[PDB]
C-alpha cells in the first residue's frame, strides 16, 4: 500500500498529497484541499512556524513502530506483536491523525485537524495515544512473538 | 574517602572522589576475595595479592576500582538526577586513588503566573444546541418515512436492488440485497446506474480481476418514496419508550452531548495548557546537560533506522539537532513544572488510584482487566509510565483553574 503519487499543486510534498488523499471522502477532492491547506493556515497562526515542516515532524511522531495482528492457530484469536516499517507506518499515522480528528466534538474539520497536527506536534493528543497504546501492550503481548509471520 | 566539588555549572556539578591510603587496600582485599571466587590458573582459595597482577595483567586494577567506586552511590541517593551520574575520569595509584563523576541535578525552575496563558473553549450551551439540532436531524433520516413508488428513480428516492455476482462463465457466487438513497446527482458505485431506473430493471456490469472476468447483475427490486417525518412528539415515540415528549428526547440528547463534551473539551484544554507551559517557564540548565539528552536522543533514533529519514527533511543536520535541542528543553520545562507543583501542593497518585486508571486501559489494550493489574504490580516500568501520566493529568487539571479560558462560538 502507498505508491509514488505526485505532490499536491501547492507544497511540492508527496506527504501532504497523501494527507489530502486521506481526508478525502468518497472521491470528493478539491474540497479536502480547502481543509488541508486551511489547517495549514491555522497552524502558522498558532505557531508562527512553517506548517509543512510542522506536519512532517508531527506525523513523524505519530509513526508507530510496532502493532498487533489477530491470528488463528487451531482455535481462534491470538495476539501477535509485529514490527511496523516502510510505507505502512507513514500511512498508519496519517490514517490516525485524520481518523481521530473526524470522531470529535468541536465544529469544523479544518480546525480539528490543526488541533491534532499541533498536539501531535507537541507529542500529545489522542493521535499519539494509539501510538504508545499498542506499543505498551507490545511489551505486554511479548510472549507471543514466536507466532510471528 | 574524600569528596570535593571541582566546578558547578547550573545543574551540572562535578565531583572528585579521592580515596587512597588504606581503603584502597580494603577494596584491594574485597577485590582479591571476589576475584579468588572466579577464574583460576595453573597455580584453591589461598591465592594472595602477588599472583594475580603478575598474571591477569591489568584486569585486577579495573576490578579493584569497581569496589572503590561502590563507596560513591551512597553519597548520591538523596539527590534527584535528570541524568544518571557519568564517570569522567578514573585512576588508581599504588598509594592513592581518584575518581571523578559528573552529576546532573534536576534543573532549577522559575514559573510565572499561570494566569498569563490562555486556553480556548467552545461555547458549551451553544455547541450542544448545534449537537442536538444535528442529532435529531440524523435521527429523522434513520426513521425515514417511505412508500412504494412507480416512477423512475429520481434523486431522493430509496431504491432497493439485489445484486448477484457471476463467475467468469456462470457459476453464481454471491447474492445480497443492497439499498440506497439517491444522493442529489451522484457518482457513487452502482447507484449512479440505478438513477432514473424503474422497478424490475436490471443493470449488468462486467469487470476483470487478475485475468478472470466477473459479472454483476443488479436488479432493481423496489423504489420507495422518502419523506422524512416532521420534528414532533411523534419522533420521540419513534425512538422507543421513556420519552413521551420531544422536549424530553432533546433533553436526553443534550445530556448525552454534555457527556461527550465534558470529556473531549476538558481533555483539549489540558492539552493546550501543556503545549504552552514553556512560555511562562524558565530554568537553569547546563548547556551540556541538554547537549547530552540531545545525543541521548539522536543516537536512540538510529536504533530504529528512523534518524536517516528524519534528518533528510531539514536543511542541514545541524539545524535538526538545533530544532531537536529546544524541543527537549521545552519538554523538560513542562515535565519539570509538573513534577514540582505536584510536590508543593502535595499531589500524589496512590496505589489504589494507580489501579483505577489501569482498568481504564484494559478495554483498549483488548485484555482482561485483571491481566493489567497483574502487569502493573509485577512490572516496575509500565507501573511508572502509567503512574506519572495520571499525576500529570492531575496537576494540569489544577493549573487549568488559574488560566484564562477564552470562550469561542461555534463556526460549524
Curated annotation (Swiss-Prot), chain A:
Protein's recorded name: Small ribosomal subunit protein uS7
Single GO biological process annotation from the record: ribosomal small subunit assembly
Entry keyword set: Ribonucleoprotein, Ribosomal protein, RNA-binding, rRNA-binding, tRNA-binding
GO cellular component: cytosolic small ribosomal subunit; ribosome
Organism expressing this protein natively: Thermotoga maritima (strain ATCC 43589 / DSM 3109 / JCM 10099 / NBRC 100826 / MSB8)
Keyword Ribonucleoprotein part of the UniProt annotation: yes
Membrane-spanning segments: none
Protein function: One of the primary rRNA binding proteins, it binds directly to 16S rRNA where it nucleates assembly of the head domain of the 30S subunit. Is located at the subunit interface close to the decoding center, probably blocks exit of the E-site tRNA.
PROSITE patterns, sorted: RIBOSOMAL_S7
Source taxon at top rank: Bacteria
Protein's gene: rpsG
Disulphide bond pairs: none
Family per record: Belongs to the universal ribosomal protein uS7 family.
One Pfam family named in its UniProt record: Ribosomal_S7
Assembly with partners or alone: Part of the 30S ribosomal subunit. Contacts proteins S9 and S11.
GO molecular function, one term: rRNA binding
Gene3D superfamilies in the cross-refs: Ribosomal protein S7 domain (1.10.455.10)
Swiss-Prot record, chain B:
Enzyme Commission no: 5.2.1.8
Residue ranges of domain PPIase FKBP-type in the record: 156-229
Gene Ontology cellular-component terms listed: cytoplasm
An annotated Gene Ontology molecular function: protein folding chaperone
SUPFAM superfamilies cross-referenced by the UniProt entry: FKBP-like, Triger factor/SurA peptide-binding domain-like, Trigger factor ribosome-binding domain
Pfam families in the record: Trigger_C (PF05698), Trigger_N (PF05697)
Gene3D superfamilies: Transcription elongation factor, GreA/GreB, C-terminal domain (3.10.50.30), Trigger factor ribosome-binding domain (3.30.70.1050), Trigger factor, C-terminal domain (1.10.3120.10)
Keywords tagged on the record: Cell cycle, Cell division, Chaperone, Cytoplasm, Isomerase, Rotamase
Subcellular location, record wording: Cytoplasm
GO biological process, one term: protein transport
Residue ranges of coiled coil: none
The UniProt record lists the keyword DNA repair: no
Enzyme class: isomerase
Protein origin, superkingdom: Bacteria
Catalysis: reaction(s): [protein]-peptidylproline (omega=180) = [protein]-peptidylproline (omega=0)
Main function: Involved in protein export. Acts as a chaperone by maintaining the newly synthesized protein in an open conformation. Functions as a peptidyl-prolyl cis-trans isomerase.
Assigned protein family: Belongs to the FKBP-type PPIase family. Tig subfamily.
HAMAP family hit by this protein: Trigger_factor_Tig
Domain text: Consists of 3 domains; the N-terminus binds the ribosome, the middle domain has PPIase activity, while the C-terminus has intrinsic chaperone activity on its own.
Protein's UniProt name: Trigger factor
The organism of origin for this protein: Thermotoga maritima (strain ATCC 43589 / DSM 3109 / JCM 10099 / NBRC 100826 / MSB8)
Amino acid at each position: 500500500m502507498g505508491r509514488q503519487i505526485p505532490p499536491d499543486p501547492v507544497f511540492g510534498d508527496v506527504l501532504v498529497a497523501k494527507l489530502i488523499n486521506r481526508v478525502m471522502w468518497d472521491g470528493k477532492k478539491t474540497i479536502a484541499q480547502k481543509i488541508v491547506y486551511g489547517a495549514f493556515d491555522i497552524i502558522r497562526e498558532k505557531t508562527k512556524k512553517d506548517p509543512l515542516e510542522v506536519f512532517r515532524q508531527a506525523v513523524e511522531n505519530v509513526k508507530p513502530v510496532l502493532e498487533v495482528r489477530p491470528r488463528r492457530v487451531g482455535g481462534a484469536t491470538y495476539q501477535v506483536p509485529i514490527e511496523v516499517q516502510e510505507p505502512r507506518r507513514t500511512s498508519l499515522a496519517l490514517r490516525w491523525i485524520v481518523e481521530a480528528a473526524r470522531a470529535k466534538k468541536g465544529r469544523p474539520m479544518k480546525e480539528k485537524l490543526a488541533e491534532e497536527i499541533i498536539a501531535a506536534y507537541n507529542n500529545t493528543g489522542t493521535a499519539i495515544k494509539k501510538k504508545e497504546d499498542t506499543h505498551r501492550m507490545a511489551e505486554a503481548n511479548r510472549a507471543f512473538a514466536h507466532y510471528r509471520w | 574517602m574524600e569528596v570535593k566539588e571541582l566546578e558547578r555549572d547550573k545543574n551540572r556539578v562535578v565531583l572528585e572522589y579521592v580515596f587512597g591510603a588504606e581503603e584502597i587496600a580494603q577494596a584491594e582485599d574485597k577485590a582479591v576475595r571476589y576475584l579468588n571466587q572466579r577464574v583460576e590458573i595453573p597455580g584453591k582459595g589461598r591465592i594472595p595479592k602477588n599472583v594475580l597482577k603478575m598474571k591477569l595483567g591489568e584486569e585486577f586494577q579495573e576490578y579493584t576500582l569497581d569496589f572503590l567506586m561502590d563507596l560513591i552511590p551512597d553519597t548520591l541517593k538523596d539527590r534527584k538526577l535528570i541524568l544518571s551520574p557519568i564517570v569522567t575520569e578514573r585512576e588508581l595509584k599504588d598509594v592513592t586513588a581518584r575518581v571523578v563523576v559528573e552529576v546532573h541535578e534536576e534543573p532549577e525552575v522559575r514559573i510565572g503566573d499561570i494566569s498569563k496563558i490562555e486556553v480556548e473553549k467552545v461555547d458549551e450551551e451553544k455547541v450542544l444546541e448545534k449537537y442536538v439540532e444535528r442529532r435529531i436531524e440524523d435521527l429523522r433520516e434513520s426513521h425515514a418515512l417511505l412508500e412504494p413508488k412507480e416512477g423512475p428513480a429520481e434523486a431522493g428516492d430509496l431504491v432497493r436492488v439485489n445484486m448477484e455476482v457471476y463467475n467468469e462463465e456462470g457459476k453464481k457466487l454471491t447474492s445480497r440485497e443492497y439499498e440506497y438513497v439517491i444522493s442529489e446527482d451522484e457518482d457513487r458505485p452502482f447507484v449512479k446506474d440505478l438513477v432514473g431506473k424503474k422497478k424490475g430493471d436490471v443493470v449488468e456490469i462486467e469487470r476483470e480481476y487478475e485475468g478472470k472476468k466477473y459479472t454483476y447483475k443488479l436488479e432493481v427490486e423496489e423504489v420507495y418514496k422518502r419523506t422524512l417525518p416532521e420534528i414532533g412528539d411523534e419522533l420521540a415515540k419513534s425512538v422507543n419508550n421513556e420519552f413521551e415528549t420531544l422536549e424530553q428526547l432533546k433533553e436526553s440528547l443534550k445530556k448525552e452531548g454534555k457527556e461527550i463534551y465534558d470529556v473531549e473539551m476538558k481533555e483539549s484544554m489540558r492539552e493546550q495548557l501543556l503545549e504552552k507551559l514553556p512560555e511562562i517557564v524558565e530554568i537553569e540548565i547546563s548547556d551540556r546537560t541538554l547537549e547530552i539528552l540531545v545525543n541521548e536522543a539522536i543516537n536512540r533514533l538510529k536504533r530504529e533506522g528512523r534518524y536517516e529519514q528524519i534528518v533528510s527533511s531539514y536543511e542541514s543536520e545541524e539545524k535538526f539537532r538545533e530544532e531537536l535541542k529546544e524541543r527537549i528543553l521545552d519538554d523538560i520545562k513542562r515535565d519539570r513544572v509538573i513534577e514540582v507543583l505536584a510536590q508543593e501542593k502535595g499531589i500524589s497518585v496512590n496505589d489504589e488510584e494507580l489501579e483505577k486508571e489501569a482498568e481504564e486501559l484494559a478495554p483498549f489494550w483488548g485484555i482482561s482487566p485483571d491481566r493489567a493489574k497483574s502487569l502493573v504490580k509485577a512490572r516496575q516500568d509500565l507501573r511508572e509510565e502509567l503512574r506519572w501520566a495520571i499525576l500529570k493529568r492531575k496537576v494540569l487539571d489544577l493549573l487549568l483553574q488559574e488560566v484564562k479560558v477564552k470562550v469561542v462560538e461555534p463556526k460549524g
